[PDB]
């Protein structure tokens, strides 16, 4: 149905160890498709998904140039940030950027993004209107003033409404075999006795794509949020993801618990129980 394309930049300064490292990764939904690392032997944009490989040489030269130029821009950004925050040139700092677009089933722009962070904290973000900015502090306000004077939002908007959705549409078609295929989770409940009267019930979800999923345990039909151990969704390494939820229950009461699974690959939410 709905899809997204996102580019992520990480610029990390390292005084005494060369110029700031610049890394870019591009994703369509939860699929990595392109990368760039300024520390690579011969730095250039490289394909990470089968469907992007058909893009011609002009595509790769252009995309590589964008990364090389932006490497310089973010290195400049790091020097500027030092000034804005009255910091010394002796420490290591990080600037991150995330930008891109979301489209609906019909492929029309749902919303665009372009935001930055400095040392892990919000710095500045393009608002949903794609015409104004939200600055996190007085330092970012200086950047906001510069971007308003340069009409950056309008230029970003042109990209987000044009090339962003246009290229995303192409990628979705070229990679429809995978980007447009949801793999439902393979589920099961394990039983692990802890002590004489306490047992661990763990609900597993494996091999699913995309990553979005909801796993919950209910006791007599009531959500057990506070007593559920929920691990972060993790990559399997084969494009799919894994996740589990566990609850410690009194021996003999296993049947009062039900695991509920929601995933777009499932026609309807699943309900599972321990099966002795």
């Amino acid at each position: 149905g709905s899809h997204s394309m996102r580019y992520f930049y990480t610029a990390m300064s390292r005084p005494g160890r060369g110029e700031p490292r610049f890394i870019t990764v591009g994703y369509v939904d939860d699929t990595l498709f392109v990368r760039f690392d300024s520390d690579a032997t011969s730095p250039r944009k490289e394909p990470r998904a089968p469907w992007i490989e058909q893009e011609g040489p002009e595509y790769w030269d252009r995309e590589t140039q964008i990364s090389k130029t932006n490497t310089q821009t973010y290195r400049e950004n790091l020097r500027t940030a030092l000034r804005y925050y009255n910091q010394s040139e002796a420490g290591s700092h990080i600037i991150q950027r995330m930008y891109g677009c979301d489209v609906g089933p019909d492929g029309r722009l749902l919303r665009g993004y372009d935001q930055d962070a400095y040392d892990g904290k919000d710095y500045i973000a393009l608002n949903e209107d794609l015409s104004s900015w939200t600055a996190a502090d007085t330092a970012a306000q200086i950047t906001q003033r510069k971007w308003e004077a340069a009409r950056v939002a309008e230029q970003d908007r042109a990209y987000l409404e044009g090339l962003c959705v246009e290229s995303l549409r192409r990628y979705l078609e070229n990679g429809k075999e995978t980007l447009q295929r949801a793999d439902p989770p393979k589920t099961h409940v394990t039983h692990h006795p802890i002590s004489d009267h306490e047992v661990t019930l763990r609900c597993w979800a494996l091999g699913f794509y995309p990553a979005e999923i909801t796993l919950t345990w209910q006791r007599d039909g009531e959500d057990q949020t506070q007593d559920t151990e929920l691990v972060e969704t993790r990559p399997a390494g084969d494009r799919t993801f894994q996740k589990w939820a566990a609850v410690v229950v009194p021996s003999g009461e296993e049947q009062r618990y039900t695991c509920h699974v929601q995933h777009e690959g499932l026609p309807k939410p699943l309900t599972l129980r321990w099966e002795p």
Partner: peptide, 9 residues
Amino acid sequence: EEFGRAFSF
């Protein structure tokens, strides 16, 4: 495809 224009802080 990326946006080729980037503006400094």
